[PDB]
Amino acid sequence: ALVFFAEDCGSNKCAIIGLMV
Amino acid sequence: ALVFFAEDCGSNKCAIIGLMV
Amino acid sequence: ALVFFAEDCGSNKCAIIGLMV
């Protein structure tokens, strides 16, 4: 599968997450 | 929001950008 | 063009690939 990269950002706090397809 | 990352490339050069959703 | 990035995962190997738009 492919894993794209995003940051999940909220109230001045970001965390990297994968989005798997 | 989610922030994805892309290299935005012109003829000679590339910059990293966030694409925010 | 924009180049996005993904980890392409097979049975064992994982490599980062670009994806161009």
Curated annotation (Swiss-Prot), chains A, B, C:
Domain of life: Eukaryota
Portion of the full sequence shown: 687 to 707 of 770
Site, Cleavage: residue positions: 1-2, 4-5
Site feature: Susceptible to oxidation: 20
UniProt effect for mutating residue 18 to V: Reduced protein oxidation. No hippocampal neuron toxicity
Effect on the protein upon substituting residue 6 to G: In AD1; Flemish mutation; increases the solubility of processed amyloid-beta peptides and increases the stability of peptide oligomers
Designated name of the protein: P3(40)
Site positions for Implicated in free radical propagation: 18
